[PDB]
Amino acid sequence: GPEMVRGQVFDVGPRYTNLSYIGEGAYGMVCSAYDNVNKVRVAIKKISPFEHQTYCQRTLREIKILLRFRHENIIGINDIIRAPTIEQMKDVYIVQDLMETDLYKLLKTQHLSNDHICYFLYQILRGLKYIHSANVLHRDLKPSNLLLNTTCDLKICDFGLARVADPDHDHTGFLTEYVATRWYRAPEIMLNSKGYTKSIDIWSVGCILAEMLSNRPIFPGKHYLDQLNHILGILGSPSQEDLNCIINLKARNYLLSLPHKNKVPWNRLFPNADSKALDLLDKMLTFNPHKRIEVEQALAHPYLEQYYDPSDEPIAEAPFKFDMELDDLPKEKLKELIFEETARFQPGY
Numbered sequence: 001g002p003e004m005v006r007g008q009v010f011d012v013g014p015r016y017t018n019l020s021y022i023g024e025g026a027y028g029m030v031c032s033a034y035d036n037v038n039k040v041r042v043a044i045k046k047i048s049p050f051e052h053q054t055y056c057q058r059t060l061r062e063i064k065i066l067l068r069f070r071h072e073n074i075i076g077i078n079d080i081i082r083a084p085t086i087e088q089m090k091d092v093y094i095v096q097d098l099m100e101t102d103l104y105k106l107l108k109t110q111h112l113s114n115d116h117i118c119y120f121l122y123q124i125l126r127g128l129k130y131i132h133s134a135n136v137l138h139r140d141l142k143p144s145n146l147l148l149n150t151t152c153d154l155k156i157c158d159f160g161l162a163r164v165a166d167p168d169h170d171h172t173g174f175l176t177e178y179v180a181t182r183w184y185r186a187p188e189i190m191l192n193s194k195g196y197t198k199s200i201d202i203w204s205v206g207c208i209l210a211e212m213l214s215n216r217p218i219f220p221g222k223h224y225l226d227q228l229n230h231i232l233g234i235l236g237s238p239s240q241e242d243l244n245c246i247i248n249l250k251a252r253n254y255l256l257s258l259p260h261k262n263k264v265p266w267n268r269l270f271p272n273a274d275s276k277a278l279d280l281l282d283k284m285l286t287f288n289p290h291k292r293i294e295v296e297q298a299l300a301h302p303y304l305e306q307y308y309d310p311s312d313e314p315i316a317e318a319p320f321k322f323d324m325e326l327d328d329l330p331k332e333k334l335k336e337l338i339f340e341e342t343a344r345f346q347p348g349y
């Protein structure tokens, strides 16, 4: 029968063989495999979303976005395997280039030189420039979603929480709550849970930069509200100006009830870090999202001056627009759209 990895069927043969476990998640599993047609090794992400509406919604977004993107610092889709009929489609298999490791794993076994930190950060922001220019928010940037090779090429993966937010329309009040992984969650995800912006991805990049400098997460909260206390424990209490910018009255009143905390200087937390890196970290980990540095300005910061070149940093040819955001649909309909969207890889097409 078809190959198995840790009790999970991977119905991908005969093209793809020699399956080995790489990782997993809430409704999927990732393996390495050998592509017998192209004579290369690939990654295969099995995704099983069809029992739940939210999983279907996210799977359609991930597939649509990754198929349209083409960029050196974003993982591509090479192939998609699924059953020839919608009644038989229980799973979707996304075939991608195999990368050697991710940044989470690298940081467990290795302290990184400034040279490497600098190069990785450049690549994260070059990809994010492309993602933001497409009017996409990633919303789950963290070390385990950054893939790395031995040549230090970096690719952003895991667009499972990603979405489109067309800036022609005010999205305040319509965005999903509780996005990102806790430690990489900007303050406004807690204080403005339905009206945050792409600025949340810059915060996550800041957290990643911090983690590359010390090999430990900067804001390791244990639960929703504790995360915010960890943030304020380093940044200090927000100024009155930054409080006045918080539109939600009960979030602003909640902050006004908290005890005063002083700013911990960056050089005290990272005494051996390059000074330009800390200046950039500061601007990324700025409490007020309106004052927080944007991706293009971050690329032009002096820390990345040896790599910055806007003639070699593509933006999206065709940005996503509002029409394709209308995906709050029953799971049966989402399955049909996923079936349609993956048809370009079927023999019959």
Ligand SMILES: Nc1ncnc2c1ncn2[C@@H]1O[C@H](COP(=O)(O)OP(=O)(O)CP(=O)(O)O)[C@@H](O)[C@H]1O
Residues within 6 Å of the ligand: 022, 023, 024, 025, 026, 027, 028, 029, 030, 043, 045, 075, 096, 097, 098, 099, 100, 101, 102, 144, 145, 147, 157, 158, 160
């Ligand atoms: N193309 C690839 N090459 C090598 N490793 C990969 C890969 N794609 C994913 N991985 C590895 O598998 C892990 C899980 O992949 P991914 O994050 O896409 O799955 P997932 O979305 O189900 C987990 P979650 O939903 O919690 O983010 C990654 O952290 C990474 O280590």
Ligand SMILES: [Mg+2]
Residues within 6 Å of the ligand: 144, 145, 158
């Ligand atoms: Mg992930």
Ligand SMILES: [Mg+2]
Residues within 6 Å of the ligand: 025, 158, 159, 160, 161
């Ligand atoms: Mg994911």
